[PDB]
Design a protein around this ligand. Structure first.
Ligand SMILES: CC(=O)N[C@H]1[C@@H](OP(=O)(O)OP(=O)(O)OC[C@H]2O[C@@H](n3ccc(=O)[nH]c3=O)[C@H](O)[C@@H]2O)O[C@H](CO)[C@@H](O)[C@@H]1O
Ligand SMILES: CC(=O)N[C@H]1[C@@H](OP(=O)(O)OP(=O)(O)OC[C@H]2O[C@@H](n3ccc(=O)[nH]c3=O)[C@H](O)[C@@H]2O)O[C@H](CO)[C@@H](O)[C@@H]1O
Ligand SMILES: CC(=O)N[C@H]1[C@@H](OP(=O)(O)OP(=O)(O)OC[C@H]2O[C@@H](n3ccc(=O)[nH]c3=O)[C@H](O)[C@@H]2O)O[C@H](CO)[C@@H](O)[C@@H]1O
Ligand SMILES: CC(=O)N[C@H]1[C@@H](OP(=O)(O)OP(=O)(O)OC[C@H]2O[C@@H](n3ccc(=O)[nH]c3=O)[C@H](O)[C@@H]2O)O[C@H](CO)[C@@H](O)[C@@H]1O
Ligand SMILES: *[C@H](C)[C@H](O)P(=O)(O)O
Ligand SMILES: *[C@H](C)[C@H](O)P(=O)(O)O
Ligand SMILES: *[C@H](C)[C@H](O)P(=O)(O)O
Ligand SMILES: *[C@H](C)[C@H](O)P(=O)(O)O
Ligand code: NA
Ligand code: NA
Ligand code: NA
Ligand code: NA
Ligand code: NA
Lengths: 418, 418, 419, 418
C-alpha cells in the first residue's frame, strides 16, 4: 500500500496550479459515450484510477478505448451488456452504464453497489427513473438486471430527492427514448451541464440542463464528436484551501469562478482576498488572519459536500470556532478522528462538527478513508509540525492527478513510498 | 376562542373549489409595496388574519390602506419606521418590513421574532444579506435596528442556505440600491417570481427570479401599478388531499399544475387520477385504493414542507405504511399526537414519521397548533366517525379563507362556534 | 393573563432559599393514593397549579381532599373512574390515574394526552406495561379505556426504553396484582424511590426502587399512612444556577446533594465553589470566572433534562462557548430564540445548542413557553440590563412555589402583574 | 484475505452450541491484570484475534504470558509502559492499558485511536477521568502520554455520559489510588461487574459494580488469583437469532438469561418460545410465525448495540415492518446495503432503519465491515437461496470462536477459503 511521507512547515504554499478536467464530469461523459455510434474524443481528461476503471469497463463491453490528454472511445461495436462485480466493487459510478445500455440495446446488467465508507448510497432513484421510462428492472444474484422490449418511452418525471447521479442516468437514457421527457427537480451541478453539452454535440436535444427542469427530446441515434471537459471545481477549491490555511498565495489556472461561488464566498469570509479572470482564480492569504466560518452542505450552487472535509481542516485551524453541518451523506466525518491524532480540536454531533481552534498541528501517522478526507490529511501534513505518514493514499489518486507534484511545485515536502 | 365542530362522514367530498391568491405571495408583495411612491393595487388577495396584520402594520408606518377583493396601498406618505413587538409577536413575516424601510428611507426597526411553534426560525440571513447591501445593523431592546447613510450598494451575495424569506428581503431592498446586485443560491419558490413580477411593474429591474441566480439593477425610485397575486399552491394541495383521503372527486379552479408538480406526482403515486387544464386541476379517487408514499420535504420545486401535515394524514389512512421526512423545520409533527387522539398510528423518530394504516378515524376533541396542522385536523374531522372539535381554529384563518364554506360546498358538515 | 416585570442588575443574588418538596414526587404519590383504602397525609407538598389540578381530578373520582402544608386524601369512597379531557388537556401527568384505577377497581378511563410543547410524548409504554399485567385497553373517542376481569397478574416486564412515567404506572399498578412482578430497565429517578417509599408505608412490598430492576410482590389491599415528600432537585438546581450566573452566593435549605450530583459537578466545572451538609447545599461564585461546559441530558443519575434550559442560559453568559445536547425531548429549545431577543448568542443544530459568549443581556419583552424555560427567562431578567417582560407566567406556577418571593429574598426586583 | 462460502437452505438451524467467555469481559480483565504483581489465571477465555493482540500487548510491556484453555499472566516484571501505534490501529481497546500503567508505575503512553468504521469513538472520558484521579495527560506525536508524581488520588467523579470503556478505565486505575473513589453515573454492563469481581479476588476493594455508583477504596498493591470469565451474552444473542430467523430450535450452554433480558423479551415478542435453566437458554421457533419488532439500543440492561445488526437481519425477514433505532454508535448500519445485495429491503434515516419484509434472500457476494455485521451476513448466507461469499471474514474471528464450526454443528454449510 502506497503512503505519503509529508514533512510539515509554516511555509506558505505559493505558486501556481493547473486545474484538470472534472472527475465528476469526465466519468458521466464517458459512460454516456456508450450511446454513441461513432468515435468520440473527450479532451481535458485527468489521469485518475476511476478513469482507468471506467476505461476498462467500456473495453469489457466491446468498445475500443485509447488515451493520453484526451480519451478516444468507439462505442459503435458494443456487444456485451454487463458491468461485473469485479469492477463495481472498485467504483460505484459503474451504475451509470445501466441507463445507456438499456436505452441503446434494450438490455443491461450492473452489480448493485454495496456500502460506501461515507454512506449507504442507495440507487433506488436510478432504478425507479428508468422504470418510469418504460424499463423492467430486477435484482438477481446481486445484479441490477434491466430490459425493455423496443425503445424507452418519454415520460414526465419528478425526482423524489435531488440526486446528481440519478439525474444523469435519466437524462442520458432519455436521449434515445421515443418522444419527450421532462425531468423535474433535477440536480443543477455543473457536471450535469457538461454531460448535456457533450450529448448535444452527438446529435441529442437536451434543454434546461443546470436548471431544475430538463427537457429531452428523444432521437433514434447519436453520432460522434469532440468535447473538452469542464474544469474541476473541487480540485480547485482544494488548492485554494491549501493556500488559505497556510497563509499562502496561489493562482489556479484553467478554472472558472462561476463553478464555485459558495466556496469562494466562504473563503472571503474566512479572511482571504480573491480575484477572478477569464479562466483563473487567485487567492491571497498573506498577512491576513484566518477566521472560522459556518457551513451547511447542499446541492449546487450551495456548498458542496465534496469540500466539506477541507473546510473541516480550515475551521480547525481558524480562530472563532467553526461549524460544519453535513446534510448530503450520513457518515462523512471520518477525517476528524484522524486530524485529532495530529492535535486537532473538534466535537461531533449528528450531522455537525463543532471545531475548536489550534495554532499548529502535530505530525503523526494517519490513515485516509476516502478521496476528499485523504486530501485534507495531506494538507494537514503540509502545515503540521514534524513528519506525517498518510496511509492508504490510493484514495487520493482516484480524484487528484499527481497531487504530490502539484503541491511540491507550491513548496510542499511530500514523498510517495511503499 | 373560536372552534370548529365537525361531524364526519363516509360520503366522499365532491365538487368544485375556487383557489384564492397565495398568502405567501400576497404578504411579501404587500411588504414590498413599502418601496412604492405611488398608489398600488394588489388583486386576488385572500381574506386572512395575516393580511389584516400586514395592513395594520403598514398603517402604523403612515401608509394609506384599504381592501376587499384587492388591497390598495399608498406608501408615499410613510413617515414612521418601526414594526412594533405587539404585531411582530403575532406574525413573524413582519421582518419583511426591514429591507424596504432601510432601502427607501435609510432606516428601519423591526422587533426580532421569537420562538415559533414549528421551529426556532432565526433571521440571521436577512440581517447578513442587508449588511452586504451596506446596512449597519444592531439589536436593541429586542429590536433589529437597521440604518444606512444614503443608499444601499449593490453587491454579489451568495446565500449560505436556501431561504425564501431572506431571498425576498435581499431582492426587494436591492431594487433601490446603487448599482447591480447578484443573488446566488436564491430560493426558487413561485412566490419569489410573483413578487419580482410585481416589483418590475413599478419600475424595478429584476431578472433571474425563479432561478438560483437573481440579478437586480437598482433604480432611484419605484412608481405605481396593478398586479394580480398568483394562486395558492398549498391551498390547492390541501383540497386535493381532502378529496383523496375521502376517496372523492374534486376540481380546483384558478390554479396551475406547474406550481405543484411534486405534490401532483405523489398524489398520482398514491392512486389518484389527475388531469390539468389551462387554469384548473382535477383529482378523481372514486373506486381507487389509497396507497402509502414516502415523502421528503425540500425547497421548491421539491415537496413543500407546507404540505407535510396534510400528507401525514394521507399516509395514516393509506395502505402500505408511509414515511415522511421533514428537512426544513425541526418541529413540525405537532399534528401527529392530535391525530393519534383520533386513533391514527404513527411513530416519530428524529425528522421522520413512520405511519401505520387505519381504516377509519374516530371523532375526538383536538387542538390546532399551527396553520397547516390545523387544516389536517379539519380534513381528518370530515372523514372521521362522529364529532370532532378542533380548538383554536384562528390558526386556519391566518392562512385559509373561509375554509368551512369551501369544504361545505364539497359536502362537509362543519360549524364554526365559540 | 399574568406576566412578570423584571428589572435587572449586576448585583449578585445572595441569601437563602428553602427548597420545597418535589412536584414530580408529589404528583405520582397523589395519583398513587388512589390505591389506598383509607386516609393518607402527604407532607412537604408545594403549592402549585399542577397540584390543584391533581386534587380536583381526585375529587372528581370521589376522593375527599383537603390541604395546606400537607395534602390529605381519602380515596376509600371512590366511585367514578374517569379522567376527563378538560383536566388532561391541562396536565398530562393525569395519565398516572390509569393504573391505580384499573388495579383497584378493574376499570379506568383517561383522555389520551395531546401534543406537548416540548415533544410528542406518547404513552405507549404505559399502555403496553398495563396490557402485560393482564389489562385490556382500547382507544375510544379520545379516551384510553382500560379494564380487567378481576385482579391484575404479575409478570416479568422488560421496558423497551427508560421512562419515568411508565415505570411508575407499572410499579404502582403492580402493588395490587396477584403474585410477583419484576420490572427491568426501570427508571431510577429519585421520585420513583420516594413514590415506592410512600407505597410501602401503606403495606406495599416494593423492592429495588432506584435500581434498574424493581420487584413488586402484590397484596390484596393498602392501608393509610403519613409521608413527607423528598426535596425538589430541579428547583434546587434552578436556584444554584441563579447564584452562579449572577456571580453570587447562595445556600439552599431542605435539600440533599445526593439528588443532583450531576448538576453540582457541572456547576463546579463552570467554576463554582460548592459545599454540602446533611440537608443543605451552598454555592459561592463570588470573585469567580464563569466557564462554559458541555452537557448531555440523560436519565437519572445523568444530567437531567429539566435543568437544560437553565444551563443553556449559564453557557450563554459563560466564556468558552458551551455545548448542550438534549437526548430526551425533541423540541426543548424554545427558550433559545427568546433569550436571543435579550441579546444572547447561540445556534441550534438538531438536538444540540451551540452557545456563544455574551457579557450582559439586554432587557426585552419575552414569552414563556414551558415550565423550565419560564424560569430561565426570569433568571435572565434578573441579570439583564433594563426591564424585561416575561409573558404567560402561569407556566412557572405549575412547578415553582411563589418564585418571585424566593428571588426577592435574594435581591431580585420582580413584579407579578396583569394587562 | 479469508472468506466464507455459504450455501443457503430453508433447513432450520438446530442443535446445541457452547457459549464461550465474553470477549468484552476477557479483554478488560487482561488489561486489568497490568495492576497485579503476582501471576494470574483467567479461565473460559475464547480463542480470538483480539486476545492474541492483547497477549502481545502485555508481552511488549514485559509481562509473561501463556494460554490455551486459560490465559496466564505474570505482570510482575513489567518494565515498559507504551502501547505502540502498530497495535492500537489493530484494536482500539488497547486504551485500557493507560490506566493500570499510570496507576501502578506513575506513567503510561498509548496511541490515540483513529476512526472506527462504526463511529468516531473518542476517548475523552478516559482521559478526563484519569486526570480527576490526579494524572497529568498530554497529546504528543499521536500518543496519549499520562503521568503522575506518586500515587493517584481517590476522587468523587460524575461521568458526563455513560461509557463502558471509561468506567472500567477509572474503576481499575482507582484500585491503586490513595483513598476512596466514587464513580457516579457509571456503566452497568456485566463485563464491568466481572472485571470488579476479578479485581477483588486480587485484593481490590470495589463495591457497587453493577449499579450506577461504584465505590473503590484504594490499596497499595494487588496480588494474584484465578477467575473464570462470564459467558458471552452477545454470542448467546447471536445464535438465538440464527435459530429464530431460520424457523429453528436451539439450546445454548454455559450462559445465563439474566445477562440478556432485553434480547430475550424481543425474541419472545417476535414469536419465539424461550425457556431458561441454571446455565442454559433454549429457543424454539419451529412452526412459528416470525413477527417484526421495534428496538431502541441503549446502555445495559437496555437493548445492546452489539445485537443491532443481527436484529436488523431478523426484522428484514419478519413480517409487519420493523424499526430499529441506534442511539450509541453513529454509523452502525453498514450491513444494510450489503444485505440489500441479497434482496433485503429497508431504508435508513439518521439513527433509524425502517425495515421491509422479505420471504427469502438471494445469494450474492458481500463484504464484512465489522464484527457484528459480519456475523449477520453469515447467518443471512445460511438462510438465503444460493451461494453467498462473505469477504474480509477476519472481522468475525475478532469476536466469535470458530464460528463456521459452531454453525455447521447446527446444519449450516460454510467453508473458509482464500
Ligand atoms: C459525480 C460522482 O461521480 N460523484 C459525485 C456524486 O455522487 P452521487 O451522484 O452518488 O451523489 P447523489 O447526488 O446521487 O447523492 C446525494 C444523496 O442522495 C442519495 N441518493 C442518491 C441516489 C439514490 O438513488 N438514492 C439516494 O438516496 C445519496 O445516498 C446521497 O445521500 O454527487 C455527489 C453529490 O455532490 C458528489 O459528492 C460525488 O462526488
Ligand atoms: C412566505 C411565508 O410567509 N412563509 C413561508 C416561508 O417561511 P420562511 O421565509 O420563514 O422560510 P425560510 O425558507 O426562510 O426558512 C427555511 C429554513 O431556513 C432557516 N432560516 C431562515 C432564515 C434565516 O435567516 N436563517 C435560517 O436559518 C429557517 O429556520 C428554516 O429552518 O417559507 C417556508 C418554507 O417554504 C414556508 O413553509 C412558510 O410557510
Ligand atoms: C411529572 C413528571 O415526573 N414529569 C417528568 C417526567 O415526565 P415523563 O414521565 O413524561 O418522561 P418520560 O421519562 O416518560 O419520557 C422519556 C422519553 O420517553 C418517551 N416516552 C415516554 C413514555 C412512553 O410511554 N413512550 C415514550 O416514548 C418520551 O417521549 C420521552 O422522550 O420525566 C421527565 C424526564 O425526566 C421530566 O422532564 C418530567 O418533568
Ligand atoms: C472492547 C469492548 O468492550 N467494546 C464494547 C464497548 O466499547 P466502548 O467501551 O468503546 O463503548 P462506550 O460505552 O465507551 O461508548 C459508548 C458511546 O460513548 C462514546 N464515548 C465513549 C468513550 C469516550 O471517552 N467518549 C465518548 O464519547 C462513544 O462514541 C459511543 O458512542 O462497549 C460498547 C457499547 O455497548 C460495545 O458495543 C463494545 O463492543
Ligand atoms: C466508496 C467511495 C464507494 O463504495 P466507491 O464505489 O466509489 O469506491
Ligand atoms: C408561527 C407560524 C410563527 O411563530 P408566527 O409569527 O407566524 O405566529
Ligand atoms: C405541556 C408541558 C404538557 O402538554 P402538560 O400536560 O404538562 O400541559
Ligand atoms: C473498529 C472496530 C476499531 O477501529 P478497532 O480498533 O476495534 O479495530
Ligand atoms: Na476553529
Ligand atoms: Na399508512
Ligand atoms: Na458561552
Ligand atoms: Na425536533
Ligand atoms: Na420486516
Amino acid at each position: 500500500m502506497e503512503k505519503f511521507r509529508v514533512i510539515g512547515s509554516t511555509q506558505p504554499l505559493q505558486g501556481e496550479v493547473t486545474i484538470s478536467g472534472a472527475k465528476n464530469a469526465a466519468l458521466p461523459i464517458l459512460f454516456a459515450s456508450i450511446l454513441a455510434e461513432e468515435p468520440v474524443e473527450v479532451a481535458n481528461v485527468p489521469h485518475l484510477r476511476d478513469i482507468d476503471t471506467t476505461m476498462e469497463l467500456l473495453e469489457r463491453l466491446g468498445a475500443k478505448v485509447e488515451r493520453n490528454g484526451s480519451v478516444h472511445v468507439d462505442a459503435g461495436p458494443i456487444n456485451q451488456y454487463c458491468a461485473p462485480y469485479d469492477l463495481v466493487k472498485t467504483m460505484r459510478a459503474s451504475i451509470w452504464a445501466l441507463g445507456p445500455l438499456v436505452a441503446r440495446f434494450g438490455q443491461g446488467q450492473v452489480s448493485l453497489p454495496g456500502g460506501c465508507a461515507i454512506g449507504a448510497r442507495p440507487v433506488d432513484l436510478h432504478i425507479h427513473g428508468l422504470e418510469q421510462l418504460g424499463a423492467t428492472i430486477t435484482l438477481e444474484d446481486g445484479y441490477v438486471k434491466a430490459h425493455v422490449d423496443g425503445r424507452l418511452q418519454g415520460a414526465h418525471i419528478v425526482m423524489d430527492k435531488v440526486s446528481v447521479g440519478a439525474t444523469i442516468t435519466i437524462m442520458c437514457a432519455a436521449t434515445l427514448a421515443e418522444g419527450t421527457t421532462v425531468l423535474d427537480n433535477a440536480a443543477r451541478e455543473p457536471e450535469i451541464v457538461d454531460t448535456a453539452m457533450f450529448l448535444n454535440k452527438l446529435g441529442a436535444k437536451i434543454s434546461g440542463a443546470g436548471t431544475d427542469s430538463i427537457t429531452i427530446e428523444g432521437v433514434e441515434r447519436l453520432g460522434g464528436g469532440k468535447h473538452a471537459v469542464v474544469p474541476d471545481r473541487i480540485e480547485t477549491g482544494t488548492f485554494l484551501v491549501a493556500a488559505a490555511v497556510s497563509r499562502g498565495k496561489i493562482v489556479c489556472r484553467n478554472t472558472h469562478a462561476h463553478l464555485l461561488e459558495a466556496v469562494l464566498a466562504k473563503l472571503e469570509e474566512a479572511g482571504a482576498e480573491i480575484e477572478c479572470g477569464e479562466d483563473w482564480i487567485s487567492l491571497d492569504m498573506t498577512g491576513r488572519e484566518l477566521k472560522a466560518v459556518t457551513v451547511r452542505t447542499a446541492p449546487h450552487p450551495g456548498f458542496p459536500t465534496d469540500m466539506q472535509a477541507q473546510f473541516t481542516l480550515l475551521n480547525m485551524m481558524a480562530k472563532g470556532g467553526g461549524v460544519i453541518t453535513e446534510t448530503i451523506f450520513e457518515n462523512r466525518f471520518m477525517h476528524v478522528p484522524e486530524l485529532k491524532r495530529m492535535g486537532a480540536k473538534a466535537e461531533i454531533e449528528g450531522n455537525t462538527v463543532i471545531c475548536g481552534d489550534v495554532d499548529r498541528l502535530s505530525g503523526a501517522q494517519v490513515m485516509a478513508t476516502d478521496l476528499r478526507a485523504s486530501a485534507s490529511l495531506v494538507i494537514a501534513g503540509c502545515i503540521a509540525k514534524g513528519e506525517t505518514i498518510v496511509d492508504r493514499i490510493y484514495h487520493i489518486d482516484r480524484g487528484y492527478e499527481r497531487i504530490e507534484d502539484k503541491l511540491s511545485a507550491l513548496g510542499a515536502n511530500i514523498e510517495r513510498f511503499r
